[PDB]
Amino acid sequence: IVGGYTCAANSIPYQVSLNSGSHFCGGSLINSQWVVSAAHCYKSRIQVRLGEHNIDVLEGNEQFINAAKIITHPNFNGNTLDNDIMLIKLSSPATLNSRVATVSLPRSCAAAGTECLISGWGNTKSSGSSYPSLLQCLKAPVLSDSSCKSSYPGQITGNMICVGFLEGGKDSCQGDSGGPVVCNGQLQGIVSWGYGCAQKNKPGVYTKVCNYVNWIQQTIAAN
């Protein structure tokens, strides 16, 4: 996250880290045994880490749970990142507490202008590398579709939304992918892609979660 702030402890209890030796993507806990992340974050084996404050230290109050099933959207396109959503079933149910909690799926799509919270352990600099140990947060609004399409001509599908600032300076970045965009208590975006990070006229692009609630429910119901 570039241009954000250090989240307060337990502020973002639904945030998870996806680990395959080291942190590589974020994700969001939606119920005791299911995590939502980005399809491009797919790996054959994944350890889900929950309740983490500092990803470099083991404080005893986190939970590490292996993925048992990893299901990428059937129409995911690895080249354009359309349908960039994936579900992870945990090997065992997480124990929910003050540090590990869930976020609601969206009851309706977010309108342009709605204020959201983006979080993650990704790069905090636009040029260069600097990875925080502590989870970063950023408040940013959903942009209009026309505004998003004009920033990335011919690259935005109906399953994508822009969230951020056209003036640059604040955005999600490498290491944030899969992470949440929560607006009014509902998960409306998945960190997906962009032209670099925090570049002018090039806000981040996020999977439009409100399009996928029926697929999520059907998949979960049967698995």
Partner: protein, 62 residues
């Protein structure tokens, strides 16, 4: 085995600036220049933006 930067979507600007659009996953790779790049797409974008021709020495971090 090197790498294919075509695997990533690109867009041309008004003045001909080619921009490579990258996913935000942290999957570090080690360049032939000995520098660790955040992911392969970012190495691709660096080469395009700087005009270099760095390759991938190996999928991990240097």
């Amino acid at each position: 085995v090197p790498m294919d930067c075509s695997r990533y979507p690109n867009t041309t600007s008004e003045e001909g600036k080619v921009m490579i659009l990258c996913n935000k996953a942290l999957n570090p790779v080690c360049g032939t220049d000995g520098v660790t790049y955040d992911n392969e797409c970012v190495l691709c974008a660096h080469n395009l933006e700087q005009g270099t021709s760095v390759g991938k020495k190996h999928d991990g971090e240097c």
